[PDB]
Amino acid sequence: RENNKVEILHVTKDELLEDFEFAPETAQSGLYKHVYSAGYGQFGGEPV
């Protein structure tokens, strides 16, 4: 009720590395999209 929110994202350490190593740069990582792109960097959105 105090404007607190929480989201769950299922990820193992191994596949975090998979994604970070797979992507060419951090700006194209899947996690970056969930954290930055779809939040902080989106007009009308909200920041994690």
């Binding site: 404007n3 929110k5 929480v6 989201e7 994202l9 596949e15 994604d19 899947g30 939040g39 909200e46």
Partner: protein
């Protein structure tokens, strides 16, 4: 439209205007946290960028578990006998935190469930 509607111009025009001066209204930002972790017993085939996040709160926590669908396929030492080569494989399923209680564990493991049934039969003496 947030502009505010007025009538066509006449000799006498009356409009209500809120005296907020030049104050810039602002929006309160929530504190949102992201919990990242291995909440299932296996990795997903879906790419990280594709799998979605789940909003959790007090009024739906259990619902979230139910929808997430938890399952554990694992093997433990079978101590219901006296053989070191005896192993027991179980397939546990969880819908809520109550399902991690020994009561539920027994109900989902026939090798124990039947022994509980036996217990009750013996108690019924």
């Amino acid at each position: 439209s947030k502009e505010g509607s007025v009538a066509p111009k006449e000799r006498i025009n009356i409009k209500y205007i809120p005296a907020t001066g030049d104050a810039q209204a602002e929006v309160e930002l929530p504190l949102k946290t992201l919990v990242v972790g291995d909440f299932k017993g296996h990795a997903e085939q879906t790419p990280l960028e594709e799998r979605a996040t789940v909003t959790v709160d007090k009024n739906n926590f259990e619902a979230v578990m139910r929808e997430s669908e938890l399952k554990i396929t694992a093997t433990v030492k079978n101590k219901l006998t006296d053989d070191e080569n005896a192993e027991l494989p179980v397939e546990l399923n969880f819908k809520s935190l109550a399902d991690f209680a020994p009561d539920a564990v027994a109900s989902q493991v026939p090798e124990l469930k039947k022994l509980i049934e036996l217990r009750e039969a013996l108690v019924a003496l």
